[PDB]
RNA sequence: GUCUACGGCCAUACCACCCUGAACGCGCCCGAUCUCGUCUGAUCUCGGAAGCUAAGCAGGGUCGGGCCUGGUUAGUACUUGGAUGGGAGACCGCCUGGGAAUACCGGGUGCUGUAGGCU
RNA sequence: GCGGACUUAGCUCAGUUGGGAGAGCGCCAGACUGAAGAUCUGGAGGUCCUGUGUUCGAUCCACAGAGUUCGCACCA
RNA sequence: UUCGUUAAAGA
RNA sequence: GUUUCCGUAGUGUAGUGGUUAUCACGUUCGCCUAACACGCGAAAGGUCCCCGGUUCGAAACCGGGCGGAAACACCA
RNA sequence: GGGGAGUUUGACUGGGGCGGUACACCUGUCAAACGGUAACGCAGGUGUCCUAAGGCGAGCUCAGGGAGGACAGAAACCUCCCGUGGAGCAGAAGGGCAAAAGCUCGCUUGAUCUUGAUUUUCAGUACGAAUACAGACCGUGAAAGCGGGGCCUCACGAUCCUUCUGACCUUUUGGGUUUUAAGCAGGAGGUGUCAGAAAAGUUACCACAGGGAUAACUGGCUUGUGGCGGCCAAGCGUUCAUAGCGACGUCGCUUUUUGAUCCUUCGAUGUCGGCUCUUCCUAUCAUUGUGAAGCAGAAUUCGCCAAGCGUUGGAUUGUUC
RNA sequence: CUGUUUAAUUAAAACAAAGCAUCGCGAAGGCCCGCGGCGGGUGUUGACGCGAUGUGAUUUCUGCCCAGUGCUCUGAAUGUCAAAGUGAAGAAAUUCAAUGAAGCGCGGGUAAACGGCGGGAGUAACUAUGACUCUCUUAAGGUAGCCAAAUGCCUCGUCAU
RNA sequence: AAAUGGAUGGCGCUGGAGCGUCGGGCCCAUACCCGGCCGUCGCCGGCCUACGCCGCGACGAGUAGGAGGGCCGCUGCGGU
RNA sequence: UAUAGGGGCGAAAGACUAAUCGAACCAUCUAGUAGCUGGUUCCCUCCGAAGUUUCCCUCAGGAUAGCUGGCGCUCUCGCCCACGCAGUUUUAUCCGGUAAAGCGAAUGAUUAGAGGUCUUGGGGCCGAAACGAUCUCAACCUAUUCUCAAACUUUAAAUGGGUAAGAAGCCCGGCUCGCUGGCGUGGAGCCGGGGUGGAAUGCGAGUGCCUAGUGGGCCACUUUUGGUAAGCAGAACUGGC
């Protein structure tokens, strides 16, 4: 009964936020959208030709097809039944890269360099990403000044 | 005789009765939905790969087996 | 709305943009001894009354004004149809307008 | 006139007078200053303000009756132009009425469930100031008694506080007499202008 | 230390006012016969180069307005989860975690790629 | 959807053997007029519902469209 | 062919 | 309470198929009578209920109030 | 041609009908910062309009404000400056747009034909709408490119039948020619109850299968409304607030009225009033014991303990009243 | 008025009734029955008869409207109008054109046929009520009578008994 | 201040058997741990009805409904 | 004796027509249909719901999807290292526009005081009148100040959503292309080779067929819509009946 048409809840989401109204920058176009690139979706208000849908905003997908002045992305969308991989045709202006895969490739390159150094010098490296360890038995310093005594203040309106 | 209209109560529990599934298995991804000019590239490229790849790859395999 | 007299549109016989005379589509008189007409006459002849249902509750007030496009060039004679959305008023081919014209009425 | 026993604490979103209502009648209160409206800042040193405690809704008719009672006690106590009272609270929340019996079960049912605008109340947060009275130093008890007479009339529980500030300004009375004379604060009618140091030099040349 | 042509970041780079500009360059400027389009060579095109940094432009400044950033506001308003907590209600307090913004004050105000020329 | 009729000067109508226009009710100026009524004479107001072809020339010829009425069975 | 009415006395 | 309709000179009303201030009564001036009625020649009187939107242009088409007018409020 | 026959009387609904369409499609909120998410929730719209208000290219910048200029005034025309969207984009709103998607000018119909894929609703079915492509013929532009309708969000329709278009198409039944008929592919003639039946009313003479999924009694929650109290006191009370009153505001009780819901009852709980009869409550009319008055006496008013005992005879109306 | 009626909840103000009316029909007919025949009822009957209705003794009255829905009359002067028939095109199916029976439309009559009967404003030397007057208006605007009626929401209308 | 007589459950309770802060003990549910028995499932053993015999461990509630077993039962038929 | 069932008869009540009449009685079609009441017969064991999406002249019903059971199949463990999954956390990377806050910031409202003097309107003064001059008021501007907005917002939480955390990955060498094109240029596909120790915790997983019931729900913490409120009507998460 909410009149389920296209973009019935997009008063804010497909809007340019503040001090950004105008022509689109050209570095949005001048990007390398090859196949297999993990990209993100963020709709634009200026270009009304290729915004995907209000349901795919903020999602993350994989490129399968590239054309003249758009791109094709497969996106895992959740519905009532189960999540499904869906094929969308989105223009270039709505799409940016995802730096998480780039950070993972940087970690893979650093691990390969550490493994090359390990095979060279015979030194074990422990290249697994361990989480935040518990704090070691470290040592504090209280020289010069006594610890400052804190007391709670009285109530004043 | 007014009835209850619409609800999504007791729905996520029915979703998780059977463990909502990723498709999770697509090796050698499907090819339909891709640019027909790119397909006119790729099919002719594949059949000429099937035709004319013998002698140069054979001599390259012999050369890399001799050099390694 | 307003459509012009002539229009250069792709005709399927020769395969080029040729000019087309544009006329209004008439539905035309229904031919007797068609298949459903003979079936309805055979079904109606007899004490059965109105056998097939007749439509009553009409609510649309307009019709899709479609255009008959004829090839202007000789020995082609290609005729086909173009569909436009529903319109109430329809000018045939005349009375083009201007922007700087005064209103004298 | 329905009681305030039924129109009560905040249970709905604020529904103000706007393009979408277009059916609200006129509010009960129209004015908000009653004492010396053109009073200077140095005329009345102190002020007492009425702090709420319950997250409630105060009606414009209750604000009317309270400001009439406080004005009457001030003109009985310190006479005309010996006080300045300001109702800090402004009514914007428009309540709705669903009236019936326009005496049988045959007018309507719960068919049309949305109501018509009856009156205007004001949503009050905890700690929000209802009224503020600025007077002389010797009129400390009269402000307390006037806000007590308003306390007997407003619903719920609320307290009184004599402010540390100098009247309606946001600056302290302890630093006011020390700091209006040297550099910064300049009197502007009943208000006080605070100059920063991030000004053009022509303002400092026009001053001093 | 700079400019010109094309730019990327889109006000740290806009707006108002006041100073400086040596060499190329950028421009204001000098005229309609051809290309040109207008009521008007005002705008756009055609071959310039007599003067000029007055203007654009490029730098500096304004206890400048805005912008960005940092304290204060503030562990405050809020908020995931909990109680056989309080209160008649209104709401409030606590355990566990996350944690915002305006007034107020302080600092800055262009960084660079390609190609080319002047000290 | 057929067949047929009215589409005309402020209003009501006439007008094909196709050769440019009328009658009355309305307006103005005149004729007798104690005041009116009535009568008589002369003018303005018609690109004939519109468009397309025949004719030297469509108000009446032929087709289509746009408002009104008239009888008919009304298979999405 | 249409064309109504003019108080009261006071000679 | 619900659904429709109306509001125009002092009075009753017409009027847009967007581009008037319309008809009669009422008031006033003159002629006619000796003088009133009546008749004739004329003039004045409009916020087209109030406020906005559409359009070059609204009272006119539409939206919200104001004051009235019609129909229903039935089964227990 | 209701003389007679057969059939129908849409659905939602704080019971049904009346009222409305929340029955089909859009905007914002509800909506709790992914998305989805209800009601007869709210504020609104739509069944159209455009051969230009489509497409391209070029030029210009809007609404408003200030200053000036003969008639010129509040608005007639010209010029200068400020002017970030305060204008316009056909229309209800939201988003978006400045050498622009706004205004003007010049050409043009890409609003053309055809095969797939995807998004939206979603069951991942259809329709409508839309997206990125691909193949022809093209329009504009110097080219870049843009364009297969409207800057985007809606503006529209199944089977069967009818009609039109196309191949120098197939079948027209033993074989040929011609006419006709059928088919193939795509445009139209609609189901607004909008995924689509062809449809008036009454039954107090009614009947059947059922429902307390569903009203008219009581009872249950609530107390708007009715009634009964309290709080501060501007004033009435000749003077004087509180002897008695009390506005403007505000806090409570009751089911003795009415309203709201449908929780029980539809294989029945007999529906008003009166007569008669028993019990209970106090928010006390009188009686017993008291306090206060603007209580001199008498007669009244306000309160407390207090339901033990009384609380009529009648004319009218079926009466409750 | 006497009479009759809901046997088994009504006895009536209900029905019937004489009186007053209206319409159809001159027998190859009016109104009806029947599946059928020139078969039947009225009919062994003939406008003082039969058939179909309204109202309901006597007295006094029977107002005004054919705009609407009905009923009836007239004319191929005239629009529409189906089968059949006529002419033409073709090889034929088929198509076209004119000719046009009833009915409808065009005109009239009929309301003791169904039915219907208006709302504002200004007006009299105390004031009100208002003879009278202007305009819109339909087909006609409730006439003679009667009344809060068995008919009146306000209503327990106002006065009298 | 409300209608039959009635409700911290009643009885009762005031140096508490009321109120708020708490200390140590005490009572039990089909909850937990250990153990005995039945059944299901999983893994498995053996060349002792193989459709039988053991071994280990974790688990058993449930309307509508769906399966597996019955050396539960009734009537009749052929072998026995 | 005559009138016999959609018929008769009726001084008219739809009354009477064999105790039945607003359409008699008997038999047959007929065991008429019913989305509608009631009922549905032995035990034990195992698993075990829903009152929801969409469509229907649909609202007491059905279809479809979801929830569920049964039947299997493909594999994996038991002998310094596997494959894979998660109503979960961690490390990185995006998304939003609610709570809050603000309006001396745009839009819409809204209070009060001050300063300035352009403009018109209304009073008073110098006096023929005179923007010749003066005071106040009205409107305007500037800096302030009060209170807000579900259909306002510069800013902007908590909670949450998507993605990556490797042998399907990284690098090297070489062919093909009718795609593209200054270029052996770019991009896709194909072939050969190299090294697996790539966040935590827990778990053995993938897949095919058939189908019943379900499609009347309710309550509670928290967030909320209408109503004065309800043991009222309607939504979101989670849990329970
Ligand atoms: Mg349901
Ligand atoms: Mg047949
Ligand atoms: Mg026949
Ligand atoms: Mg020239
Ligand atoms: Mg020239
Ligand atoms: Mg020049
Ligand atoms: Mg200079
Ligand atoms: Mg310069
Ligand atoms: Mg600078
Ligand atoms: Mg600054
Ligand atoms: Mg909490
Ligand atoms: Mg007279
Ligand atoms: Mg019938
Ligand atoms: Mg219904
Ligand atoms: Mg959301
Ligand atoms: Mg959410
Ligand atoms: Mg342009
Ligand atoms: Mg400018
Ligand atoms: Mg718009
Ligand atoms: Mg193309
Ligand atoms: Mg439907
Ligand atoms: Mg019926
Ligand atoms: Mg009867
Ligand atoms: Mg009350
Ligand atoms: Mg119920
Ligand atoms: Mg009840
Ligand atoms: Mg319910
Ligand atoms: Mg009984
Ligand atoms: Mg009983
Ligand atoms: Mg007693
Ligand atoms: Mg009897
Ligand atoms: Mg007689
Ligand atoms: Mg008589
Ligand atoms: Mg009569
Ligand atoms: Mg014939
Ligand atoms: Mg007649
Ligand atoms: Mg009558
Ligand atoms: Mg009088
Ligand atoms: Mg009379
Ligand atoms: Mg007790
Ligand atoms: Mg104790
Ligand atoms: Mg079990
Ligand atoms: Mg029979
Ligand atoms: Mg029968
Ligand atoms: Mg009987
Ligand atoms: Mg019957
Ligand atoms: Mg029968
Ligand atoms: Mg049976
Ligand atoms: Mg349903
Ligand atoms: Mg199913
Ligand atoms: Mg399964
Ligand atoms: Mg299973
Ligand atoms: Mg939102
Ligand atoms: Mg808020
Ligand atoms: Mg079953
Ligand atoms: Mg059910
Ligand atoms: Mg509920
Ligand atoms: Mg439980
Ligand atoms: Zn052609």
Q: Is the CB of A137 under 7 A from strand E?
A: no
Q: A23: CA distance to ligand 17 center in Å?
A: 14
Total residue length of chain A: 157
Task: Determine whether the interchain pair B35/A85 forms a contact, defined as Cβ–Cβ distance below 8 Å.
Answer: no
Q: Is the CB of D80 under 7 A from strand H?
A: no
CA D92 / C1′ L159 distance in Å: 31
Instruction: Sort A18 into a burial class: Cβ within 10 Å, 0-12 / 13-18 / 19+.
Output: exposed
Q: Is the CB of C36 under 7 A from strand F?
A: yes
Query: Residue D184 and residue D207: Cα distance in Å, rounded?
Result: 10
Task: Determine whether the interchain pair B22/A72 forms a contact, defined as Cβ–Cβ distance below 8 Å.
Answer: no
CA B4 / C1′ L47 distance in Å: 32
b/e map of A19-57 (b: 16 or more CB within 10 Å)? Answer: eeeeeeeeeeeeeebeeebbbbbebbeeeeebbbeeebb
Q: What is the distance, to the nearest Å, from the Cα of residue B45 to the centroid of all Cα atoms in its chain? A: 19
> Three-class SS of residue A72?
strand
Which residue of A78, A83, A86 to mutate against B (max B Cβ within 10 Å)? A83
A43 Ramachandran zone, left/alpha/beta (phi>0; psi -120 to 50): beta
Q: C46: CA distance to ligand 47 center in Å?
A: 28
Q: Which residues pair with C9 in a beta bridge?
A: C18
| DSSP one-letter code for C40 | H
Give how far A19 is from chain B: nearest CA, Å.
Answer: 38
Tokens matching residue D25: 């009648």
Sorted by sequence, the CB contacts under 8 Å of residue B59 that are 6+ apart come out as none
Residue tagged 């959740």 (tokens): A78
Strand E bases near protein CB (under 7 Å) are 7-11, 62-65, 89-92, 104-106
Q: A4: CA distance to ligand 33 center in Å?
A: 78
For residue A64, give the chain B residue with the closest CA.
B34
Q: A80: CA distance to ligand 35 center in Å?
A: 70
Task: Determine whether the interchain pair B33/A72 forms a contact, defined as Cβ–Cβ distance below 8 Å.
Answer: yes
CA C41 / C1′ F2 distance in Å: 20
- Find and give the residue nearest to I247, measured CA to C1': D65
Q: What's the N-to-C CA distance of chain D in angstroms?
A: 59
Torsion sign, CA atoms D99, D104, D106, D111: positive
Interface partners of chain A (CB pairs < 8 Å, 3 or more) are B
Sorted by sequence, the CB contacts under 8 Å of residue B10 that are 6+ apart come out as none
- Write phi, then psi, for B14 (nearest 5 degrees): -65, -30
Give how far B68 is from chain A: nearest CA, Å.
Answer: 21
Q: A39: CA distance to ligand 6 center in Å?
A: 55
Tokens matching residue C8: 């250069």
A144 Ramachandran zone, left/alpha/beta (phi>0; psi -120 to 50): left
The CA–CA distances, whole Å, from A122 to A114, A127, A128, A130 equal 11, 14, 17, 22
Query: Residue B68 and residue A65: Cα distance in Å, rounded?
Result: 39
Strand H bases near protein CB (under 7 Å) are 1, 19, 56, 64-65, 73-76
| DSSP one-letter code for D180 | T
Task: Determine whether the interchain pair B22/A76 forms a contact, defined as Cβ–Cβ distance below 8 Å.
Answer: yes
Q: Do chains C and D touch (3 or more CB pairs under 8 A)?
A: no
Nucleotide nearest to A28 (CA to C1'): E8
Task: Determine whether the interchain pair A82/B34 forms a contact, defined as Cβ–Cβ distance below 8 Å.
Answer: no
Of D144, D129, D160, D153, give the one whose Cα is nearest residue D74: D144
Q: Which residues pair with A91 in a beta bridge?
A: A70
* Residues A36, A63 contacting (CB under 8 angstroms): yes
Query: Residue A100 and residue A128: Cα distance in Å, rounded?
Result: 18
In chain C, positions 4-33 with C-beta closer than 7 Å to nucleic chain F are 29-30
Torsion sign, CA atoms A65, A71, A76, A77: negative
Query: Residue A140 and residue A142: Cα distance in Å, rounded?
Result: 7
Note residues around ion ligand 59 (Cβ under 5 angstroms): C 11, 13, 18, 71, 76, 78
CA D21 / C1′ I43 distance in Å: 8
Sheet holding D116-123, edge to edge: D57-59, D116-123, D93-97
> Three-class SS of residue D160?
strand
CA C105 / C1′ J136 distance in Å: 35
Q: B1: CA distance to ligand 14 center in Å?
A: 9
CA C46 / C1′ J73 distance in Å: 40
- Write phi, then psi, for D47 (nearest 5 degrees): -150, 145
Sorted by sequence, the CB contacts under 8 Å of residue A127 that are 6+ apart come out as A111, A114, A115
């Amino acid at each position: 009964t909410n009149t389920k048409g296209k973009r019935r809840g997009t008063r804010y989401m497909f809007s340019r936020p503040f001090r950004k109204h105008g022509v689109v920058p050209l570095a949005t176009y001048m990007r390398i959208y090859k196949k297999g690139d993990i990209v993100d979706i963020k709709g634009m208000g200026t270009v009304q030709k290729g915004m995907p849908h209000k349901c795919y905003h903020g999602k993350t997908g994989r490129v399968y097809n590239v054309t003249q002045h758009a791109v094709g992305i497969v996106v895992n969308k959740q519905v009532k039944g189960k999540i499904l991989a869906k094929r969308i045709n989105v223009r270039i202006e709505h799409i940016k890269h995802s730096k998480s895969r780039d950070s993972f490739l940087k970690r893979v390159k650093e691990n390969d360099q550490k493994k090359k150094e390990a095979k060279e010098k015979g030194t074990w490296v422990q290249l697994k990403r361990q989480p935040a360890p518990p704090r070691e038995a470290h040592f504090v310093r209280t020289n010069g000044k006594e610890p400052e005594l804190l007391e709670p203040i009285p109530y004043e309106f | 005789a007014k009835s209850k209209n619409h609800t999504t109560h007791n729905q996520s529990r029915k979703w998780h009765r059977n463990g909502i599934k990723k498709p999770r298995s697509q090796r050698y991804e499907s090819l339909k939905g891709v640019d027909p000019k790119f397909l006119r590239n790729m099919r002719f490229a594949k059949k000429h790969n099937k035709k004319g790849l013998k002698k140069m790859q054979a001599n390259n395999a012999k050369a890399m087996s001799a050099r390694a | 709305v307003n459509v012009p007299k002539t229009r250069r549109t792709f005709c399927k016989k020769c395969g080029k943009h040729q000019p087309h005379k544009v006329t209004q589509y008439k539905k035309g008189k229904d031919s007797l001894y068609a298949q459903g007409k003979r079936r309805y006459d055979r079904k109606q002849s007899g004490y059965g009354g109105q056998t097939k249902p007749i439509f009553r509750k009409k609510a649309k007030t307009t019709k899709k004004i479609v255009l008959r496009l004829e090839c202007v060039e000789p020995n082609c004679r290609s005729k086909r149809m173009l569909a436009i959305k529903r319109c109430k008023h329809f000018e045939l081919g005349g009375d083009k307008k201007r922007k700087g014209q005064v209103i004298q009425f | 006139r329905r009681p305030a026993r039924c129109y009560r604490y905040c249970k709905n979103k604020p529904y103000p007078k706007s393009r979408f209502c277009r059916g609200v009648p006129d509010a009960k209160i129209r004015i908000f200053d009653l004492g010396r409206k053109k009073a200077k800042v140095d005329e009345f040193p102190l002020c007492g303000h009425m702090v709420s405690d319950e997250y409630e809704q105060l009606s414009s008719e209750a604000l009317e009756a309270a400001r009439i009672c406080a004005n009457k006690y001030m003109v009985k106590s310190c006479g005309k132009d010996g006080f300045h009272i300001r109702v800090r609270l402004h009514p914007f929340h428009v309540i709705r009425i669903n009236k019936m019996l326009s005496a049988d079960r045959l007018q309507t049912g719960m068919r049309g469930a949305f109501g018509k605008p009856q009156g205007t109340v004001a949503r009050v947060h905890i700690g929000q100031v209802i009224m503020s009275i600025r007077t002389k130093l010797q009129n400390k008890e009269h402000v307390i008694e006037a806000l007590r007479r308003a306390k007997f009339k407003f619903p719920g529980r609320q307290k009184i506080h004599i402010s540390k500030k100098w009247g309606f300004t946001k600056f302290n009375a302890d630093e006011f007499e020390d700091m209006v004379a040297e550099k910064r604060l300049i009197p502007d009618g009943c208000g006080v202008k605070y100059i920063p140091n991030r000004g053009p030099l022509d303002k400092w040349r026009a001053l001093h």
